[PDB]
Design a protein around this nucleic acid. Sequence first.
DNA 1: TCAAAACGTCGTGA
DNA 2: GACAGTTTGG
DNA 3: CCAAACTGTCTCAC
DNA 4: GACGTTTTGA
Lengths: 152, 152
Amino acid sequence: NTKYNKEFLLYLAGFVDGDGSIIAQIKPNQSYKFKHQLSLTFQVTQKTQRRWFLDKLVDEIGVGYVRDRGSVSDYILSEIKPLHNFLTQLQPFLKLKQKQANLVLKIIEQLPSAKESPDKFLEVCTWVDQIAALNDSKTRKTTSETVRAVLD
Amino acid sequence: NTKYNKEFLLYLAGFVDGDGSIIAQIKPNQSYKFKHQLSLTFQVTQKTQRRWFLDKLVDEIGVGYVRDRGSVSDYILSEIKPLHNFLTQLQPFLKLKQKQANLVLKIIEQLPSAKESPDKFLEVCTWVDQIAALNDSKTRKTTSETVRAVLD
DNA sequence: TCAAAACGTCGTGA
DNA sequence: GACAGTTTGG
DNA sequence: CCAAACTGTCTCAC
DNA sequence: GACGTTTTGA
Ligand SMILES: [Mg+2]
Ligand SMILES: [Mg+2]
Ligand SMILES: [Mg+2]
């Protein structure tokens, strides 16, 4: 469980607040018990000409990867354990996205317990609803209310 | 002549690298001896719903102001003396915009010299060219060579 | 004749 | 920036 | 059944 | 984000 230097986190927290995104998602998939996946992503987006900055991030955070879409790239961190360790440390330095971050940690910690009850799975889906409410979200489709219907 | 806190600077450098802009412009203006003004701007842009963040910048930096344009607002610092002092302290923490910041610092120092000599004035204009070359620049119009013409 | 503020908008890079 | 829909392989 | 990866795009907020 | 044009005020 990696310790990150505070100088790294202060800078990163400011950059993340600007160009980064903290994302909670409910993805319909029929292979899943509740017929949806809970997905959690930390990402930093940057123009591909600046990709080196994202590649350095991978080296610094020590986990995650960069993905290319044309003129733009993203650092992506998905795996739950590293994500928790990293967001825990970054959270206190965030200003704009700090609420989002603390909710993700909550969703993560409750994730096992949410695969039992349709009820707890919903309670956690409303937290997703919350993170989306904080983000500037124009494109969203699947919500805790989507899940609600399906479960009935 | 304010000394800024290092934690404040580290975070802000990150944010600036993400959402900020270090801008140099040659503004054609007929009231000027060389028929152009040399203009420097440090800005941070954010959605107006987040304007509180920008307001806190004014308080923290101690100088500058917030402007509104539609759905979006900007922290603006154009005052050359405060600007020099601020950027001098921010620059070593900048990863993406550090060269721009240094060019600005160099322009500000050389500005009195620029106002005497058309040759020196043109020289400083080439430094602003180099800032635009570093920024993701699209709508740029007036350049050092545009100035050179008018001078002849 | 200047420094700074005020106002306005393209082309993305988030 | 913040999603979407789809595939993979234990 | 699941975590995680892979792949694509809409509407801005820079 | 990164420019543009125009006006203000010593
Ligand atoms: Mg931003
Ligand atoms: Mg941005
Ligand atoms: Mg950026």
